[PDB]
Every structure is written in C-alpha cells, then in structure tokens.
Design a protein around this motif. Structure first.
Motif, short mmCIF file in Angstrom:
data_model
loop_
_atom_site.label_atom_id
_atom_site.label_comp_id
_atom_site.label_asym_id
_atom_site.label_seq_id
_atom_site.Cartn_x
_atom_site.Cartn_y
_atom_site.Cartn_z
N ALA A 39 1.87 -0.17 8.84
CA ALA A 39 2.73 -1.37 8.75
C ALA A 39 3.06 -1.88 10.15
CB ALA A 39 3.98 -1.07 7.93
N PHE B 245 0.85 -1.21 0.00
CA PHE B 245 0.00 0.00 0.00
C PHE B 245 0.88 1.26 0.00
CE2 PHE B 245 0.31 1.42 4.46
CZ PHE B 245 0.90 0.32 5.06
N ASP C 97 2.22 5.69 6.64
CA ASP C 97 2.22 4.30 6.12
C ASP C 97 3.01 3.42 7.09
OD1 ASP C 97 0.60 4.94 3.85
OD2 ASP C 97 2.31 4.93 2.52
N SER C 98 4.04 4.01 7.70
CA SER C 98 4.98 3.28 8.58
C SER C 98 4.20 2.77 9.80
CB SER C 98 6.14 4.13 8.99
OG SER C 98 5.68 5.30 9.64
C1 LIG Z 1 7.63 3.18 2.09
N1 LIG Z 1 7.39 3.48 3.50
C2 LIG Z 1 6.71 4.70 3.90
S1 LIG Z 1 7.53 2.18 4.62
O1 LIG Z 1 8.86 1.57 4.48
O2 LIG Z 1 7.39 2.68 6.00
N2 LIG Z 1 6.35 0.95 4.35
C3 LIG Z 1 6.48 -0.39 4.93
C4 LIG Z 1 5.67 -1.40 4.11
O3 LIG Z 1 4.33 -1.05 3.96
C5 LIG Z 1 4.13 0.24 3.47
C6 LIG Z 1 4.92 1.28 4.26
#
Ligand SMILES: CN(C)S(=O)(=O)N1CCOCC1
Length: 191
Positions: free
Chosen positions: A148, A106, A144-145
């Motif tokens: 996850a 995502f 997003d972090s």
């Molecule tokens: C690309 N990023 C903001 S991330 O590394 O934090 N990520 C981990 C995996 O799922 C989506 C978000």
C-alpha cells in the motif's frame, strides 16, 4: 512481459551461490526466489521466469531437486540459461484518480475486490490474482502495509504484474514466509 525467449549468462559468486531457487510446475521449471545482490538478480532473472535450458540441456520434466543438483554440479565459470519471460503473469497499467486511488482491495498480496468506476475496473483488473510486481519492483513477501505504501508513493501511472492465485500458491509452496520477506530481491535493479 516480453513475448519471447532470451539467453542469460551467469557466474557463481565467491561462495559458489547464484542466488536462485527453482520449482517444478506442469513439467516446466520456474523461478521461485531471486536473492538480493546475487548473480541471478544482476543478470535480471525474475520470480515466475521459466527456465527452458541450463547449459543447453532441456529442463522439461526435471524435479526441483534435479534442477538444484544440476546448478550445483556446474563448472560455473559461465552458466547459460534459456529463459521465457514470466509466462504465468500479465501486466496492467492503471491511473490514480485525484484521491490517489487505482481502485482495488487486496489481502496477503491477493486482489479481493475491484471498486466500481475505477481505473482498475476500466482496465479489467481481476480478483483471485497475487501481486508479483509494482512499477518493475518485486513485492512478493512484503507486508500488505508496505505494498500500500509503494502504491501511495507511486506516480499517477501504476503498472501491476499479476498471477492467478492457484498458480502463485503452487510456486511458493515449501518456501518459508520469512525467506520471501528477508531474501526475495525487492530492490530497483542496478544499471
Ligand atoms: C489491513 N492492513 C494490513 S492495511 O491497513 O495496512 N492495508 C491498507 C490498504 O491496502 C491493503 C493493506
């Protein structure tokens, strides 16, 4: 996602707030924001809920302005709402594999790929869908972090509540991204 209408009884707090922003969509009214520690969160209003009635007046056709005006002009000792449960959303149940994966990617809360041979493929998870909730917790406006992280710390059963991106993008229009992050109730509900 309950398959019916429910009555909620609401009570303006000491500051005359209920903790709700409402949005006109397809001539209905929908919940755009439920504020943490508000009357709206304690009665269990959720992002994407449809408001059918306020104090037994029908909402069909109201502007967002008029819904906000009606809420303000209410002798709010007791406000009744008739609610249809998150009508634009669906819930999907998936199981982590032993590597801890449910099997998607995502971006900005939007699913962009399904990984072959995964629980997400087996359960027909769709792309172009925004993540509204994980395991009963609202995640809208989180980084997003942090989404996850929540999936990481979940048990092997993962419940995800999703919404078509076009409908999602229409609902959150004219709500600043930091209000969603700061003020959208992300908590586990109180009992
Ligand atoms: C690309 N990023 C903001 S991330 O590394 O934090 N990520 C981990 C995996 O799922 C989506 C978000």
């Amino acid at each position: 996602i309950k398959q019916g209408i429910r009555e909620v009884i609401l009570c303006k707090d000491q500051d005359g707030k209920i903790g709700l922003r409402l949005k006109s969509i397809d001539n209905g009214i929908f919940v755009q924001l439920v504020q943490a520690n508000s009357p709206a969160s304690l009665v269990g209003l959720r992002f994407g809920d449809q408001v059918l009635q306020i104090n037994g007046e029908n909402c069909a056709g109201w502007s967002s302005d008029k819904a906000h005006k009606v809420l303000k002009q209410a002798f709010g000792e007791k406000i009744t709402m008739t609610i249809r449960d998150r009508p634009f959303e669906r819930t999907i149940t998936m199981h982590k594999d032993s590597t801890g994966h449910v099997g998607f990617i995502f971006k900005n809360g939007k699913i962009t790929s399904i990984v072959k041979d995964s629980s997400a493929a087996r359960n027909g998870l769709l792309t172009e869908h925004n993540i509204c909730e994980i395991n009963g917790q609202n995640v809208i406006g989180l980084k997003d972090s942090q989404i996850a992280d929540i999936l990481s710390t979940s048990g092997t059963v993962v419940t995800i509540t999703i919404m078509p991106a076009f409908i999602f993008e229409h609902i959150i229009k004219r709500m600043a991204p930091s209000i969603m992050k700061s003020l959208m109730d992300h908590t586990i509900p109180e009992v």
